Amino acid sequence: GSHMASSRQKYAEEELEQVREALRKAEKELESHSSWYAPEALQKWLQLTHEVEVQYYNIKKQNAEKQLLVAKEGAEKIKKKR
Amino acid sequence: GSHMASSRQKYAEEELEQVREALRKAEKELESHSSWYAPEALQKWLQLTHEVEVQYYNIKKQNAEKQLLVAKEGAEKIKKKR
């Protein structure tokens, strides 16, 4: 099998690790910076962070549950290995 | 107070929402694409996704608990409000 393939969606590692540091840095500096301005910005910031947080979460939850069922059926129909 | 401010770290919304769709898209296409190549790429992909997932998760957990304690102390010393 192809152990090395032309994976173009592997960009995910860049995206996720950078966003981990970028966004968590933003979070921490934002919660630090909030003391300078009106809390509405923090409300919005926290709303957006949490909105998207629950979004990715939910998306993969839904996908994962689907995958669990789909791949279970598929695996038991093909051959279920280990 | 300043309701509108020169928040430059507000890029976080772009970052998180794009990565939400980008990375979840990558995940789904990757788990779909994996059948074309060796599962090691999926192992690596899932390892990276989950690594970083638990990383940002943990970081903000750590920060959040610190924030809880720090801000508790601060708020009770300044004047805690609602």
Binding site: G1, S2, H3, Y57, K60, K61, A64, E65, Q67, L68, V70, A71, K72, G74, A75, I78, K80, K81, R82 | E31, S32, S34, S35, W36, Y37, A38, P39, A41, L42, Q43, L46, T49, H50, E53, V54, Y57
Partner: peptide, 23 residues
């Protein structure tokens, strides 16, 4: 193991169980 962790493992194993590729 947290919700994401457990489902990571479960779904990853399941996905490859069907879509392993080089099975």
């Amino acid at each position: 193991g947290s919700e994401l962790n457990e489902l990571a493992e479960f779904a990853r194993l399941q996905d490859q169980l069907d879509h392993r590729g080089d099975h």
